[PDB]
Design brief:
- This protein is 40% helix and 19% strand.
- It contains 30 helices and 27 strands.
- Bound molecules: zinc ion.
- Zinc ion (ZN) binds next to helix 1 and helix 4.
- The site of zinc ion has 4 residues, from helix 1 and helix 4.
- One of its GO terms (cellular component) is peroxisome.
- It catalyses: Degradation of insulin, glucagon and other polypeptides. No action on proteins.
- GO terms for molecular function: amyloid-beta binding; ATP binding; ATP hydrolysis activity; beta-endorphin binding; endopeptidase activity; identical protein binding; insulin binding; metalloendopeptidase activity.
């Protein structure tokens, strides 16, 4: 009845909570398709996943599939303009990205719901007739080179590639997926290769309809979505490509029983333990690898981690199955390492094998399976509604692995108890199949090997056969017990009836010296979940570097202490977040509401009566020291942002000040700090979800009463509720602050054009301008000018003040970067003068959709309110208000705003620039086809942050709504 469709699927199993409608189908050309209809969605979305990636890169052109991914965005026969795609999305409230894994290339976008077809049509052409334009290729190669550059000095990426380097060199696993200028341009030139043709060959070879899945989400009916997907995708050609497979493991015989000693960039201490395993993917109905992951990676009483931590050897552990590709997987057990732990690796691994032996001795446990199965069933039933773009991306990828009818449920619902598989996998976790990697600065100078792509310094040794034996004879350790029943498993899921006096926004339901309580019963999502957000104010968390250190250590020690007990809550979908802030403390509790009161109470009770284990204090202090030091290894652009925070905020302690003050933190001194901190507080809370007003008032009073009882807490004076201000820059001023990054060989720059206080009008001026310049900026400064991978523009908001910021990471020096941004600003003004009245209105419309986009899930809506509360603006109806005003703005208003605040000769330009110089750059000046960059004034070089701040006014704070 339709030659274009091979088959429609049966019912797609969904959560009964889920109001969205679904249809699976397979096209005649073999594209597997999931259609999602949500007539309420603000943004629509599509994604396509090709089952080809890096593992299929030609051996002579490393990174070609990743390069292909970049290239697809840059013009097709039907839509030749390099930025037609991104520009269209931008003008219609959409966004887009893509990634390349070993076996996948995944492309996705969202757009205003009214413009699905326009978006999707442009999108489809990626997979039909890409141009791979000659000039785009030459340019885009730098973006990829830049992508790789930032990864070079990153410890995760180095370990990632090092593993691949130390397996079978013949195996596709050993390939370099990212690529760079060398692999994508330099080497290929030297070798007579036309990469444009190679891109064409590759696309044509592997971009076969038979290796593709597509997911589309929109307001349209399932039938309309069907016609649409047929109309645009049934013309993709079926080239019948065999799906690549890797049945032989990249780790063979001679790759096992190997030790690797590795030098990190950061001062980190890690042990990596790895076993080769078969592909467990097909066993998705039982997840035997996850069963063992769940047990070996447990953190409750009796667990592997518990003992390792008690012995003061490790702080954290990750265990479980790790993805490989079709035909191979890994099982891992990874831990960080204390100083002591570094000298006891052999015992740690013994304990690991002892725990595994316990699992053998006990045999597989149906009740453990049953518990996971139940938790997963609940998780799936009450899953939060996803944002469309993440969802379509995810589904496109998993359409390759499960029957149509099962795509939604397959990763959640367990069906089979499989003691056989559990033992089969367990039988592979043996010392004769082990790989051990130690990462420590102590191997500095003691290595004899260098990994090609990153330069990673390492050494390789056979593990002594006697050590293997010691591990093989590991017997039972009395310290290791399986976890017992999980008491935190929720059973009460009733959604409370919507109260008579319920409101659309949070209501101030308690206003006392001790606490401000904001409250909202959920009127949208109707899942049995809640958010309990608390802000504790104390001047003593940030009075000086010492106290800041102490606030941090206190809360880290608290969390470390609670970890065992809290682990079960987390498995049961009840988690918490607890950290020190520049104003005191922040506590959030979220998840199923049923057992929250229990977790919260244990938290507050513990913090009010805390007793510190000295062993733990020393270990945590030491890790915190390294943590601070390790900032020197963050990326230039991150340093840039850091220095701006420091320059523009009234009060801010530097990482240098914090670490210098850290040696003065003694056990006696901390014990004294805690009661001090807790003795006077103000609390501002937002309780939001499946809870009544009486429950909310009840919870708030419980928190207070616990503090009063155990810590004697009294209220804080209203005048002690100190918010910090932002530095007020002089009209027509320009400051430059300059530092060097000693790890990375790239530059970073942040340029901040401060405007004025936040307000309806000032907000929308800035925001409209950012909307208009957003993609032109990416297009000019990255795509055309290829300055770097990281090119960013948009609003800066802090302390109630705002402005325009640019952030770039580049191999080019900041003074050069600077003039290009300035050049760009002028382009934008002409551009704004040149654009139609409609083109203007389209941008108003796009920002309007962006701002009005409704949160899909409780925590997202909660987050919007929390922003209103923590900023002390309390403007819960901001979106409607600000959009109404947005629609009033004319082209002329924006031109004036720019001329008055932003232009190079603007009367009220307030400019700060942070230059972060590359490792290899000695000094560097602060000032200096392509568009015209204007002449700039001499900047005032900031010599000292304190003096700079002392010499300027401070802005007012914003007035509450
Ligand atoms: Zn990329």
């Amino acid at each position: 009845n339709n030659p274009a469709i091979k088959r429609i699927g049966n019912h797609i199993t969904k959560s009964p909570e889920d109001k969205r409608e679904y249809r699976g189908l397979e096209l005649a050309n073999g594209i597997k398709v999931l259609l999602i209809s949500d007539p309420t969605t603000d943004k629509s979305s599509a994604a396509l996943d090709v089952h080809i990636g890096s593992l299929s890169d030609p051996p002579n052109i490393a990174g070609l599939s990743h390069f292909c991914e970049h290239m697809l965005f840059l013009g097709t026969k039907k839509y030749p303009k390099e930025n037609e795609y991104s520009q269209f999305l931008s003008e219609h409230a959409g966004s887009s990205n893509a990634f390349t894994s070993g076996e996948h290339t995944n492309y996705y976008f969202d757009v205003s719901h009214e413009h699905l077809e326009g978006a999707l049509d442009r999108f489809a052409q990626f997979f039909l007739c890409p141009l791979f334009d000659e000039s785009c290729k030459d340019r885009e190669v730098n973006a990829v080179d830049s992508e790789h550059e930032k990864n070079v000095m990153n410890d995760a990426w180095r370990l990632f590639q090092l593993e691949k380097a130390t397996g079978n060199p013949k195996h596709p696993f050993s390939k370099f997926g990212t690529g760079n200028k060398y692999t994508l341009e330099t080497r290929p030139n030297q070798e007579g290769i036309d990469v444009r043709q190679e891109l064409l060959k590759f696309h044509s070879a592997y971009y076969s309809s038979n290796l593709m899945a597509v997911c589309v989400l929109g307001r349209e009916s399932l039938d309309d979505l069907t016609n649409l997907v047929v109309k645009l995708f049934s013309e993709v050609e079926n080239k019948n490509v065999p799906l690549p497979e890797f049945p032989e493991h990249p780790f063979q015989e001679e790759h096992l029983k190997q030790l690797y000693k590795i030098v990190p960039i950061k001062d980190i201490r890690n042990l990596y333990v790895t076993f080769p395993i078969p592909d467990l993917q097909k066993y998705y109905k039982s997840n035997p690898g996850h069963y063992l992951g769940h047990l070996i990676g447990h953190e409750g009483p009796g667990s592997l981690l518990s003992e390792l931590k008690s012995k003061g050897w490790v702080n954290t552990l990750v265990g479980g199955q790790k993805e490989g590709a079709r035909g191979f997987m890994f099982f891992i057990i990874n831990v960080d390492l204390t100083e002591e732990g570094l000298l006891h690796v052999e015992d740690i691994i013994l304990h690991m094998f002892q725990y595994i032996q316990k699992l053998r001795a006990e045999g597989p446990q149906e009740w453990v399976f049953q518990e996971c199965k139940d938790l997963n069933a609940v998780a799936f039933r009450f899953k939060d509604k996803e944002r469309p773009r993440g969802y379509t991306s995810k589904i496109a990828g998993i359409l390759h692995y499960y029957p149509l009818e099962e795509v939604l449920t397959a990763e959640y619902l367990l069906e089979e108890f499989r003691p056989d598989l559990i033992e089969m996998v367990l039988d592979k976790l043996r010392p004769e199949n082990v790989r051990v990697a130690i990462v420590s600065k102590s191997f500095e100078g003691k290595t004899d090997r260098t990994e090609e792509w990153y330069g990673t310094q390492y050494k390789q040794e056979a593990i002594p056969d006697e050590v293997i034996k010691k591990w093989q004879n590991a017997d039972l350790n009395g310290k290791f017990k399986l976890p017992t029943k999980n008491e935190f498993i929720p059973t009460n899921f009733e959604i409370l009836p919507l109260e008579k006096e319920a409101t659309p926004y949070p209501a101030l339901i308690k206003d006392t010296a001790m606490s401000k309580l904001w409250f909202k019963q959920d009127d949208k999502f109707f899942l049995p979940k809640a958010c309990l957000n608390f802000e504790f104010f104390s001047p003593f968390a940030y009075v000086d570097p010492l106290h800041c250190n102490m606030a941090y250590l206190y809360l880290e020690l608290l969390k470390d202490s609670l970890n065992e007990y809290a682990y079960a809550a987390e498995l049961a979908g009840l988690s918490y977040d607890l950290q020190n802030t520049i104003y005191g403390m922040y506590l959030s509790v979220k998840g199923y509401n049923d057992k929250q009161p229990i977790l919260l109470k244990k938290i507050i009770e513990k913090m009010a009566t805390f007793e510190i284990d000295e062993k733990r204090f020393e270990i945590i202090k030491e890790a915190y020291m390294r943590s601070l030091n390790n900032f020197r290894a963050e990326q230039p652009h991150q340093h840039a942002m850091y220095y701006l925070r420091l320059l523009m905020t009234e009060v801010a302690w530097t990482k240098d000040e914090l670490k210098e003050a850290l040696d003065d933190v003694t056990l006696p001194r901390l014990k004294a700090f805690i009661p001090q901190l807790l003795s006077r507080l103000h609390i501002e809370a937002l309780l939001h979800g499946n809870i009544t007003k009486q429950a909310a008032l009840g919870i708030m009073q419980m928190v207070e009463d616990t503090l009063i009882e155990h810590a004697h807490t009294k209220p804080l004076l209203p005048s002690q509720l100190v918010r910090y201000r932002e530095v007020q820059l002089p009209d027509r001023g320009w400051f430059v602050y300059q530092q060097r990054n000693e790890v990375h060989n790239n530059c970073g720059i942040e340029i901040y054009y401060q405007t004025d206080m936040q307000s309806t009008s000032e907000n929308m001026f800035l925001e409209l301008f950012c909307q208009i310049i957003s993609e032109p900026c990416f297009n000019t400064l990255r795509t055309k000018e290829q300055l770097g991978f990281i090119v960013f523009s948009g609003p800066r908001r802090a302390n109630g003040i705002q402005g325009l910021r640019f952030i770039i990471q580049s191999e080019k020096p900041p003074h050069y970067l600077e003039s290009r941004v300035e050049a760009f600003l002028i382009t934008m003004e002409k551009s704004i003068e040149d654009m139609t009245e409609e083109a203007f209105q389209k941008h108003i419309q796009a920002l309007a959709i962006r701002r009005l986009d409704k949160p899909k899930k409780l925590s997202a809506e909660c987050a919007k309110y929390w922003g209103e509360i923590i900023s002390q603006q309390y403007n819960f109806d901001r979106d409607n208000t600000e959009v109404a005003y947005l629609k009033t703005l004319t082209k002329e208003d924006i031109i004036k705003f720019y001329k008055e605040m932003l232009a190079v000769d603007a009367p009220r330009r307030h400019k700060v620039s942070v230059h972060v110089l590359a490792r290899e750059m000695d000094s560097c000046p602060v000032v200096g086809n392509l568009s015209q960059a204007p002449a700039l004034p001499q900047p005032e070089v900031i010599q000292n942050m304190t003096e700079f701040k002392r010499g300027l006014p401070l802005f007012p704070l914003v007035k509450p709504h």
